[PDB]
Design a protein around this ligand. Sequence first.
Ligand SMILES: NC(=O)c1ccc[n+]([C@@H]2O[C@H](COP(=O)([O-])OP(=O)(O)OC[C@H]3O[C@@H](n4cnc5c(N)ncnc54)[C@H](O)[C@@H]3O)[C@@H](O)[C@H]2O)c1
Ligand SMILES: NC(=O)c1ccc[n+]([C@@H]2O[C@H](COP(=O)([O-])OP(=O)(O)OC[C@H]3O[C@@H](n4cnc5c(N)ncnc54)[C@H](O)[C@@H]3O)[C@@H](O)[C@H]2O)c1
Ligand SMILES: NC(=O)c1ccc[n+]([C@@H]2O[C@H](COP(=O)([O-])OP(=O)(O)OC[C@H]3O[C@@H](n4cnc5c(N)ncnc54)[C@H](O)[C@@H]3O)[C@@H](O)[C@H]2O)c1
Ligand SMILES: NC(=O)c1ccc[n+]([C@@H]2O[C@H](COP(=O)([O-])OP(=O)(O)OC[C@H]3O[C@@H](n4cnc5c(N)ncnc54)[C@H](O)[C@@H]3O)[C@@H](O)[C@H]2O)c1
Ligand SMILES: [Zn+2]
Ligand SMILES: [Zn+2]
Ligand SMILES: [Zn+2]
Ligand SMILES: [Zn+2]
Lengths: 367, 367, 367, 367
Amino acid sequence: MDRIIQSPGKYIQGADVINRLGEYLKPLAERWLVVGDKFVLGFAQSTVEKSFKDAGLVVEIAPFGGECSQNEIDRLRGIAETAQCGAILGIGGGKTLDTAKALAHFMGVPVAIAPTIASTDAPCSALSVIYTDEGEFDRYLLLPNNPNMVIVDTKIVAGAPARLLAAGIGDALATWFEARACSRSGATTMAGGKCTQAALALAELCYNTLLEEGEKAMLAAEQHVVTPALERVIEANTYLSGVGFESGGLAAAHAVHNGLTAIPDAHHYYHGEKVAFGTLTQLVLENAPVEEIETVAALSHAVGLPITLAQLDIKEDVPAKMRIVAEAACAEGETIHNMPGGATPDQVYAALLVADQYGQRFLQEWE
Amino acid sequence: MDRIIQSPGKYIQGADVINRLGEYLKPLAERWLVVGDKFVLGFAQSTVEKSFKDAGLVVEIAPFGGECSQNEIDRLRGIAETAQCGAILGIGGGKTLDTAKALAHFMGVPVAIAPTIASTDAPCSALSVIYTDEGEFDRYLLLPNNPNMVIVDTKIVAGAPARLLAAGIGDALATWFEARACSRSGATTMAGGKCTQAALALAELCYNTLLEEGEKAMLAAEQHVVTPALERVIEANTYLSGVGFESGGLAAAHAVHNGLTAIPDAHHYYHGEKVAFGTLTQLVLENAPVEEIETVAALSHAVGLPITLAQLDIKEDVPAKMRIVAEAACAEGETIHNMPGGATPDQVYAALLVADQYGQRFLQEWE
Amino acid sequence: MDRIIQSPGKYIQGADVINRLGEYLKPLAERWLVVGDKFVLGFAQSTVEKSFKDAGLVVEIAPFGGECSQNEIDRLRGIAETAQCGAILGIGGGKTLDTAKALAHFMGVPVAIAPTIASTDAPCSALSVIYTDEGEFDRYLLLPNNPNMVIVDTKIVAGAPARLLAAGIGDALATWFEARACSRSGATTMAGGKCTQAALALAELCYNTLLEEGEKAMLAAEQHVVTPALERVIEANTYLSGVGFESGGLAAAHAVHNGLTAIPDAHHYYHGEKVAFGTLTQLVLENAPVEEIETVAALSHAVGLPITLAQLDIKEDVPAKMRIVAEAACAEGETIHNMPGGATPDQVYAALLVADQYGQRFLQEWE
Amino acid sequence: MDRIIQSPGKYIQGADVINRLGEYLKPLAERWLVVGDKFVLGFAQSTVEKSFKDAGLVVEIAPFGGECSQNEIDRLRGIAETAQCGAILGIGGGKTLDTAKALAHFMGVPVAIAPTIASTDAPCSALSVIYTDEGEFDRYLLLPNNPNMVIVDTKIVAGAPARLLAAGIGDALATWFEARACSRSGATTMAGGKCTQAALALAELCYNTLLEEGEKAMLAAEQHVVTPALERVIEANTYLSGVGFESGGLAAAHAVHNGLTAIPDAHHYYHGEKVAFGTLTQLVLENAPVEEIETVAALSHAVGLPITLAQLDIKEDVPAKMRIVAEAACAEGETIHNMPGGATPDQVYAALLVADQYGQRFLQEWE
Ligand SMILES: NC(=O)c1ccc[n+]([C@@H]2O[C@H](COP(=O)([O-])OP(=O)(O)OC[C@H]3O[C@@H](n4cnc5c(N)ncnc54)[C@H](O)[C@@H]3O)[C@@H](O)[C@H]2O)c1
Ligand SMILES: NC(=O)c1ccc[n+]([C@@H]2O[C@H](COP(=O)([O-])OP(=O)(O)OC[C@H]3O[C@@H](n4cnc5c(N)ncnc54)[C@H](O)[C@@H]3O)[C@@H](O)[C@H]2O)c1
Ligand SMILES: NC(=O)c1ccc[n+]([C@@H]2O[C@H](COP(=O)([O-])OP(=O)(O)OC[C@H]3O[C@@H](n4cnc5c(N)ncnc54)[C@H](O)[C@@H]3O)[C@@H](O)[C@H]2O)c1
Ligand SMILES: NC(=O)c1ccc[n+]([C@@H]2O[C@H](COP(=O)([O-])OP(=O)(O)OC[C@H]3O[C@@H](n4cnc5c(N)ncnc54)[C@H](O)[C@@H]3O)[C@@H](O)[C@H]2O)c1
Ligand SMILES: [Zn+2]
Ligand SMILES: [Zn+2]
Ligand SMILES: [Zn+2]
Ligand SMILES: [Zn+2]
């Protein structure tokens, strides 16, 4: 059928670009409401306000509650009405960004996205994941537009905890294997149709950038400084992974991620950290060669991602819990049905236990 | 400074996609003005309407004058003000598309771009080339946004003259070499920043797609049928070349194309046909390896593109005419100054003669 | 679902093996009915008998009508009921072999299959193609068992017309590409399940054997002598192609062969000769790489197979005739729907014209 | 001379295929006698009975004594006479399967084979190894037919002890080296003639599957779950190794296995475990390169097969015992005389001691 690729209108990435934030956003609107992560506003609220004033823009700043829920969106909807703003700017982690994306949709206004961490591939997608206020998944809000603008300050990302970059590496590492599985299967992407070559090249470029730059970027992240290797991983975690998954496709790795969230032991781990184990589960599922699986496990271990179930705090009742993961991952409408030939709950259970076994062997041969 | 990539919000490509125009174009507006090429409007008007009505959309069709001129925009600006429309749809060639992009800019509405040929990389770009009502260059209108939607019907493109697909191959064949020259020089792109890895990967994917699919697609273009090879070249000619030139940068190949427009002998050749010789000029200017020039010259000849000055109808007063081309190619603000180490008119003049000699040698050794 | 491979119980191949027929065929039965091609029976009847008698077996020989038709089976069903035989032996071509397989099915006895030509992959398969007594297709009789024994005399095959060995090369050349397309799609084979690794390895060994031995075997076929190269192609044409198509699956190449049978222009061409062009059609349909198409086209031409529509006597009303071929190739239940992503009549029609254009280009550049 | 390949009529392999056992066996006969391994019947007798009843079949189940002896066969012959059965189904290990194969031969009925472990290459062969009731080798019973049907439930195999899969890996690992030695020597296979390409491709495919999937399948086997890697090794241990050895050939590895059985220290080790050391003995005998021997020793060690004599409980009187092994392996009619140039008892003794020495060095450089 039709082949579709979606993208944000403009993707900007640079060191200290938060100073130029006002100059970049002025073409979109004059009056702005900023949804900002509390931790980021703690050190950056004055810098953000200066950026808008120096470009002649009017800004109101609303600190973010911490969860992308309908109540938090509805609360900000009223603040936006009173503000009489022409656009929304989200600045913070993926939860802040999805909230600003949903806010601008209900308000009928353009949205700019400013990720302060490269932790997921949320910034560029035309999707908001809605939760309950208790942190349980509620619903997917599919958006008609990608963000108008995505502006990434590589310096601010560098100042964040290095664990949050490794989480982004875990999310982006799955992009190539899941898009490749969808193209082998003829699956429909979230963009609406079949894969293009552009998305598949961006997805594979994501994988090879992480293989080549992942460890060098973690060194810079731990030192909280910007190197070219960090710039490249930030692009791979954001633009490459985002276009790669939305127009390339999702498969078993993220379906397994959803099933791992259902286990309370691993619920509070980061998004990409649970995805990182789903990738190793998929590699068993599709019987990737030994060198491929070792390469993914080595990079995941090198940057500090979980490669065993125990590293997700799953240490007791493992079979009964992996049964719960496998059933949730194979639910109706889940992306595991994009795998070539499909996957039954028995097959996913088998892959979960064997992927865990492989990670256990990797850690032993390491120490 | 900052690295930037731009893109249309949505690129859609498929056979008989004109039937699904209204369903795709619905989330943008309900009232639509169509700027249409007269030849194209003559064979699809019934199809365009039925798709808009069956989707429940108001449509008003306005034949396109044939040239991209302010007078032509102003005429259509009047019909749009009377039409009271919410968005603009351009259906035709690069002239109809640049016109519709400019009309939607001055009207302040979204724009949909439906190319009926893959002849240039105009569809996706955020710029419109304006001309006098006679056909002589006027001004660049650098736009703030890429089109919201680009919708390419591969069956309609297949029915177009095969010469026009070769013209798009000639335009897209420059994408990689100009963007690669810009990253070797650290030049700024039309997006306003340095090259991203995404742009350079899409530009190289363009080059390799033309090498792998170009001759197979010409076979389908001459039969006026659609194959997966023709599908891929259409994508390379439209999305990959469009993002790759705008976000990767231009260099000597297009500066030489502009200089050839100053020679009245080459007026009756399409845009990509002149760019094709400019690419060979650039390959001499940067002293590309013999195997690189032979491969570009071979593909250009294999699809019908000019590889000599005579194939552009330049047979008399070649030195005097090439002096003119070099002077105009080296004008202040031209993209030839993005070459590593720059380029003087004497160096361009030298490359122009030498590349013509190479094309002559190549054609001789082919028979 | 389950992975399945089928095979004849015993495949025997050797020079002058007709002399050892009785000793091989003894453990199956003591009373034997022979369904024999009239031309073949005319030069081996004395040899067939002497081998049966010297092994101590009863034999009764029944000339074959020439077409695989229920009337022809029913006539031989009567002779078998009178013969009071314990097994059936078919000695001849694909028509004599499919007839003997059907006769042994309705009689409920084992069947031995002695191909006197390597022209198709019929000998080993568990199916018989039935026709009307005129020569027009009737029904597929899908059999519960492969033949108990396939015995190929390489010296007899060598004495056959060299055109008929090339025909078998054309049939066997499709085995790899159709089975590979089926595993890429996860389609079910005629064995009733998914592909085994054994079937895919035998199908690929078929392709590589034809590439490595095909032209050497034609030299021996035109001299009507036996070499190890001719020995290998006979095995590739009979066992490898037989197991590889039945247990690996069919795709567009054979669906196109069936569509060509609907064109009376190509009636006077053998089975493998039509399949040869169907393989090139499939290679265009799946957009195989240029080197893959050139290698298949080169081998097909090097042994005398059709690579253009004109070489199948299709020279007038080519578009109208190709519309018919595509419609029949896309009929409900045809194997073209095993292609990855399926195939519409418009896509098949496009591949049919484009592959004809490629064959024309290939023949031009060969002189 | 003649080139022959034998095969079972149908080979089926799938997870939980024991439910569909009745549906698959119905075409063969209505009344069935099942020879079943006691351990398997302990957990599966009700599932087997359900499978036959759901397909409308009549079944009697006879638990298996544990040894393939003439007394056990004769006992089951009487049970079959009383049952008035049309076919025999063997379900269990290789000893159960050979017993059902011999039973169906003396009864003159079709046989289906259902291996519950992938421990040897017995299931597909047309051979039953007869023993005395004390477990000593009695005689080879060469059969005129391969099994009509082989049905492998990959789930049941997975539930078995992982040591029994590694035993099958040891048996199958020898297949390529022994068939390759027979083709280099022009030896006659058990099929009756010289090697075909099909058998040699299946034999080499066996080797490369174990090299690529052996360790990944042991992980799944230890977890008692089914992965694609386990499915592939099960096929390699069963169909690939069986056709590979019966139509490819046997050599020194299995002759050494027979000699190792004569030592009471190693008599009770599994069949493939003794074969595994015979392979390392053959590699010394034919002077395989260092990388080849290290690759075989590494895989054998990784899955838990013996690579030293001590790992077969041969720790005292080694020279006097290796003398007994070498003499038995070179007995008249043994397969070691298929080695290129043959092997004398002195040569085999030398290879036994050096292979043991090599394994001792491998284990030291490992710890
Ligand atoms: N819509 C999509 O396509 C998509 C894709 C992936 C994930 N998501 C969503 O993204 C969310 C996860 O995002 P996340 O993992 O970034 O979580 P998050 O938004 O909660 O941020 C993680 C933590 O990092 C902290 N942080 C942010 N910026 C910082 C900085 N500069 N310095 C220090 N600390 C900083 C925040 O305070 C927060 O506690 C989930 O809701 C998930 O569903 C959406
Ligand atoms: N803005 C940019 O980035 C950019 C880039 C490249 C070129 N351009 C501009 O694009 C223009 C070149 O456009 P062009 O070369 O496509 O010429 P064009 O727009 O004049 O089209 C060429 C011809 O093709 C015909 N045609 C179109 N669709 C057809 C179909 N389906 N069947 C048959 N005929 C069909 C048209 O009627 C026209 O006569 C120039 O103005 C150039 O400056 C702009
Ligand atoms: N069942 C299957 O899987 C399968 C597969 C492919 C084809 N088929 C069927 O097989 C048939 C095609 O058979 P074919 O192409 O072999 O044609 P054919 O059986 O008519 O044989 C072709 C000619 O070769 C002659 N011939 C045979 N042996 C000879 C010898 N030693 N010397 C000289 N001449 C000899 C025969 O007399 C005959 O005239 C078709 O009915 C087709 O449908 C079936
Ligand atoms: N005929 C041939 O071509 C050929 C080839 C190789 C070996 N063989 C013969 O095969 C025999 C060896 O077979 P084997 O090694 O399988 O021995 P086996 O048949 O005794 O089975 C091994 C053990 O595995 C157990 N077992 C079987 N299925 C099980 C399951 N699902 N779960 C748990 N335990 C299970 C059995 O109870 C048994 O104790 C020997 O007699 C050898 O001569 C014959
Ligand atoms: Zn994710
Ligand atoms: Zn251009
Ligand atoms: Zn065929
Ligand atoms: Zn064995």
